[PDB]
Design an enzyme around this catalytic site. Structure first.
Site, PDB file in Angstrom:
ATOM      1  N   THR A  69       0.686  -0.987  -0.013  1.00 21.72           N
ATOM      2  CA  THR A  69       0.380   0.011  -0.023  1.00 21.72           C
ATOM      3  C   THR A  69       1.350   1.508   0.059  1.00 21.72           C
ATOM      4  O   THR A  69       0.356   2.404  -0.555  1.00 21.72           O
ATOM      5  CB  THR A  69      -0.898  -0.064   1.110  1.00 21.72           C
ATOM      6  OG1 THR A  69      -1.572  -1.479   1.508  1.00 21.72           O
ATOM      7  CG2 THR A  69      -2.098   1.157   1.097  1.00 21.72           C
ATOM      8  N   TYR A 124       5.164 -12.584   3.505  1.00 21.22           N
ATOM      9  CA  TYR A 124       3.356 -12.617   3.078  1.00 21.22           C
ATOM     10  C   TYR A 124       3.291 -12.900   2.270  1.00 21.22           C
ATOM     11  O   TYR A 124       3.861 -13.595   1.578  1.00 21.22           O
ATOM     12  CB  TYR A 124       4.217 -11.080   2.865  1.00 21.22           C
ATOM     13  CG  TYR A 124       3.203 -10.425   2.341  1.00 21.22           C
ATOM     14  CD1 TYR A 124       1.425 -10.147   2.525  1.00 21.22           C
ATOM     15  CD2 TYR A 124       3.116  -8.544   1.978  1.00 21.22           C
ATOM     16  CE1 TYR A 124       0.686  -9.317   1.650  1.00 21.22           C
ATOM     17  CE2 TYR A 124       2.679  -8.187   1.411  1.00 21.22           C
ATOM     18  CZ  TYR A 124       1.191  -8.780   0.929  1.00 21.22           C
ATOM     19  OH  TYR A 124       0.080  -7.422   0.803  1.00 21.22           O
ATOM     20  N   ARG A 184      -1.809 -11.440  -6.280  1.00 22.81           N
ATOM     21  CA  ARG A 184      -0.156 -10.206  -7.136  1.00 22.81           C
ATOM     22  C   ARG A 184       0.835 -11.235  -7.730  1.00 22.81           C
ATOM     23  O   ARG A 184       1.675 -10.642  -8.110  1.00 22.81           O
ATOM     24  CB  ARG A 184      -0.130 -10.015  -6.076  1.00 22.81           C
ATOM     25  CG  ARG A 184      -1.005  -8.461  -5.905  1.00 22.81           C
ATOM     26  CD  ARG A 184      -0.748  -7.549  -4.105  1.00 22.81           C
ATOM     27  NE  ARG A 184      -1.666  -5.909  -3.715  1.00 22.81           N
ATOM     28  CZ  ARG A 184      -1.807  -5.615  -4.736  1.00 22.81           C
ATOM     29  NH1 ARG A 184      -1.336  -5.241  -5.308  1.00 22.81           N
ATOM     30  NH2 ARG A 184      -2.765  -4.626  -4.122  1.00 22.81           N
ATOM     31  N   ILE A 242      -2.801  -6.740   9.045  1.00 28.42           N
ATOM     32  CA  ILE A 242      -1.910  -5.663   8.180  1.00 28.42           C
ATOM     33  C   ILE A 242      -3.042  -5.024   7.115  1.00 28.42           C
ATOM     34  O   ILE A 242      -3.197  -5.642   5.995  1.00 28.42           O
ATOM     35  CB  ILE A 242      -0.767  -6.111   7.694  1.00 28.42           C
ATOM     36  CG1 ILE A 242       0.308  -6.872   8.553  1.00 28.42           C
ATOM     37  CG2 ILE A 242      -0.427  -4.879   6.546  1.00 28.42           C
ATOM     38  CD1 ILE A 242       1.715  -7.444   8.799  1.00 28.42           C
ATOM     39  N   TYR A 264       6.627 -12.754  -9.125  1.00 22.30           N
ATOM     40  CA  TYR A 264       6.710 -12.793 -11.395  1.00 22.30           C
ATOM     41  C   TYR A 264       7.322 -14.347 -11.603  1.00 22.30           C
ATOM     42  O   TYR A 264       7.363 -15.062 -12.537  1.00 22.30           O
ATOM     43  CB  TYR A 264       7.355 -11.927 -11.592  1.00 22.30           C
ATOM     44  CG  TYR A 264       7.752 -11.422 -12.843  1.00 22.30           C
ATOM     45  CD1 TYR A 264       6.284 -11.160 -13.802  1.00 22.30           C
ATOM     46  CD2 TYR A 264       8.863 -12.227 -13.963  1.00 22.30           C
ATOM     47  CE1 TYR A 264       6.443 -11.037 -15.376  1.00 22.30           C
ATOM     48  CE2 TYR A 264       8.941 -12.366 -14.972  1.00 22.30           C
ATOM     49  CZ  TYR A 264       8.189 -12.165 -15.989  1.00 22.30           C
ATOM     50  OH  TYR A 264       7.573 -11.973 -17.054  1.00 22.30           O
TER      51      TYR A 264
END
Ligand code: CL
Ligand code: CL
Ligand code: CL
Ligand code: CL
Ligand code: CL
Ligand code: CL
Ligand code: CL
Ligand code: CL
Ligand code: MG
Ligand code: MG
Ligand code: MG
Ligand code: MG
EC number: 4.3.3.7
Lengths: 294, 295, 294, 295
Positions: B48, B136, B141, B206, B110
């Site tokens: 973020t 995490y 993503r 979070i 990726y």
């Protein structure tokens, strides 16, 4: 545009035991591609471990590939970044460098909008004279660049091609309907690449080409000439490699395969990529024998 | 005691001026806001915070700026994620003896490593620092899903202390808990499911929403920790339009606009490839802020 | 509402070698559920091979289950159909029959809209006095009945519950926010059922209960009493069964497991369901030993 | 010769009056329309014909009605799908010596059989009839995906002659072709990808669009069979808004409205749980019909 069509190799970055780049293995690979009809080499793309080479290493490896090529085969630089400022900077590194074009992936992890993609690629394009090949691979990036967005970007003079890695074959005519006749469509999915070319695509940026360069060059030429039955016979021989080079995350299997064929000295990768497992190795070795390469 | 790693932890925006330069005066305001409103800790230069578009050096400078401004009043956790193990190490070493209380480190994105690759990645990072590490997981993503078995393996390492689990797959709570010691910390990374995640045994969130509803989020987390789930759900219902609509366009586009609308930051500028909120998104976020009674 | 909460068994329809329904095996199963604290039996649902029993067989099997139950345990009739007229007709078959309620799945294959779901379940409800338990299982039906639709239908006096089989645990409070305090939420996903109850759900319509009835009844009671740590210890013993009873399509594995435990004489199914493969059998047998049932 | 199983085959709506009774006068019009406009064959009581809401007997009566009205002018293929093998047999036996040219039989839905179960299902059906069988794969409706290897196994049975492949996964064309003899027929079940499917070597399409664009679809298929792909693509571009928007709401809700708008049927009534087209859907379909130059 011969250099942006046909079989283009997504070239491994060969390493020694320490993970340092091996010049002598690179020379061997490049000599192999010159000799076997590969149309062009992509240097430091996804299969070349772009992720674990520094901004600087990127540059060196591309320039080394250029030097060893010595004008005998075109070199395309991998210049993708998820920050537009970094993509620009990577691109500017190769202006006046002898590379023929750049391969630039949609930003990964940050999941921009389609307008964010448009702005990203527009800015990059405006900061170079070099041809730009867009690259869509949502399975890795979390971003799917849709056909309409590709259409908008194709209007920019130096945005000349797309590497479409989804395996979604309906995209070929979705994109073609929106772009000029001279815009180039390349498969990024070896298993579906012959289908993609049969539908009107112009080539493939290929992992399989690392170990079956002549066969891949032949299949692409046959496909370009409308000799699909003949192309298919080659595709059938290669299908186990098209699939099993992804038995573990690319480029773990293809580096082992290069090693097994004598093309590179070691199959060392940089973390977080790991050596092929025994189970993967046996599977790749079998695929290589099915292809008659081993 | 573990309190800096539980409750409502803000995934802080990195405020910018109109040129995209980091705005120190805005960060001061944000940090004062979190001190004043019960936020447990600040994640600095996380997802973020536009980690993707801050350089290696900026990762460092913005975390240090945030620590300096926190002035010991609120704990700071550095985002140190990288998809190359050598880069994650380098990022982490930057904070050894800095005052940050720990690191938030995402699965490589990726390049799609195997679970063993994940294990070796996080093991190497952990071995090059004394700082506590919060893993995490956010496959939407990264293209990589760190499975509960892998989290269990990593949790055996002394300074791997927590996971930010962003999948919104609530079955992961007890799948991970079954595999780890009772002091290992589970944090939600999905605001919309975070109360559910805490009701199932998670320890905190979070949070993106906490950027614009810090007191409310802090209260909800406290209530959930106390077993006061009906009272917590009432806050959650008030906040749910924000939990959803702060993602109407890719985070942090909506939350930066919302900070601006609430007077917390001067501008909602982002760096490309992130783009200014569209009119459509803006009207939706403004309506969610009004639903929450914040505007 | 004790009969619509806790551990409700999705009962197998036991068959002989010919695929005919075995009355004596049904008697054994029902006696087992009475003895071991099962709250209710679902007769001719999904696990009972609703698909391969005729409109008539449906009826007979439910009435046989009712007769053998002899008032000792509540019986719920599976009455799902993808045509509203057929669902009505199946429902009317059991008016004044002694069943306590019906389990009715979203239409499968034809993929109605949410308004089509509303109209489907509204019509069924209006044609009976019996309590209706909605059933959402998009993985089988191609239709996902969303929470807002469940909310609308919960307003109807005899629509009293939902069997939510998605395993999507966020649905618990999404549905609860939209329905009265007395509307009943049941898990349709054994692996996530304890999570579902910990979040506020009231029970499970369970496959695992076919072979671990006492353990499932205990876990549900513990969960209802807020004794989650104790419920979890049972859930851990059963987790391999919660997963491996689906190693092949339900009810192939659970019928073999009933056979292995002596609850039914044969594990015969009707085509297109097939006998468990060796590979599946070994896995289920191992799960049964992990649970301490075999 | 195989022509009744290639080209543009219509997935015919079952027209109804306002009570949901089958309308014989409307079916006459539809059939005359298809005779007049180059349609290769009619699928009767398939998916688009509301098979799900016609009884066992109605399956029979509507197929016989359609055959009687066709009067030997166009071939008729009966939808005979069931998720119980015994029911599929019974449905198929109803047409032994009836004049239908073959059967369209979907993978069992809802019960999710294994690939061996599929093999045994279709093997049993095929063994109880002399009629040619067209397999039908549509996992989005059934929850079952019949894989190319399984289609290959079934294609060895003498009267299993074709597959309607509805996934829109174009890689299936050559994956199936690699496994079956050169006379096995591949038909698209996805109008939007069907031209692509034919360009790759498919033989035709069982088409929803063909309900309202019979001549256009027949022309496109003929051109594709002749290798005239540019000419075929021009028709496809004209029709693509229909290929998409005939699914704006669940098929056959949109196509029944479109038949009504074009005067082919008297009413667009469906049986529950299918519902009348919404205003939003209607405006979208009307616009696609105008794009196609049909309205
Ligand atoms: Cl590449
Ligand atoms: Cl992809
Ligand atoms: Cl974060
Ligand atoms: Cl995620
Ligand atoms: Cl059931
Ligand atoms: Cl489901
Ligand atoms: Cl059909
Ligand atoms: Cl499908
Ligand atoms: Mg190894
Ligand atoms: Mg704008
Ligand atoms: Mg067997
Ligand atoms: Mg309406």
């Amino acid at each position: 545009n011969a250099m942006f069509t046909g079989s283009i190799v997504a070239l491994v970055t060969p390493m020694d035991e320490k993970g340092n780049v091996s010049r002598s293995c690179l020379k061997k690979l490049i000599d192999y591609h010159v000799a076997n009809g590969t149309s062009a080499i992509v240097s430091v793309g996804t299969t070349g471990e772009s992720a674990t080479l520094s901004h600087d290493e990127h540059g060196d490896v591309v320039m080394m590939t250029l030097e060893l090529a010595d004008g005998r085969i075109p070199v395309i630089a991998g210049t993708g970044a998820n920050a537009t400022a970094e993509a620009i900077s990577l691109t500017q590194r190769f202006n006046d460098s002898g590379i023929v074009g750049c391969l630039t992936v949609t930003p990964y992890y940050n999941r921009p909008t389609q307008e964010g993609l448009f702005q990203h690629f527009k800015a990059i394009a405006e900061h170079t004279d070099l041809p730009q090949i867009l690259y869509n691979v949502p399975s890795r990036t979390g971003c799917d660049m849709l056909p309409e967005t590709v259409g908008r970007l194709a209007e920019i003079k130096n945005i000349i091609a797309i590497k479409e890695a989804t395996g979604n074959l309906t995209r070929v005519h979705q994109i073609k309907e929106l772009v000029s006749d001279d815009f180039i469509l390349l498969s990024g999915d070896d298993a579906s690449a012959l289908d993609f070319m049969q539908l009107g695509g112009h080539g493939v940026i290929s992992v399989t080409a690392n170990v079956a360069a002549r066969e891949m060059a032949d299949m692409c030429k046959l496909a370009a000439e409308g000799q699909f039955a003949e192309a298919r016979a080659i595709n059938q021989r290669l299908m186990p490699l098209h699939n099993k080079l992804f038995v573990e995350p690319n480029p773990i299997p293809v580096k082992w395969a290069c090693k097994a064929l004598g093309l590179v000295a070691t199959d060392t990768l940089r973390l977080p990529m790991t050596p092929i497992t025994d189970h993967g190795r046996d599977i790749v070795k079998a695929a290589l024998q099915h292809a008659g390469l081993l």
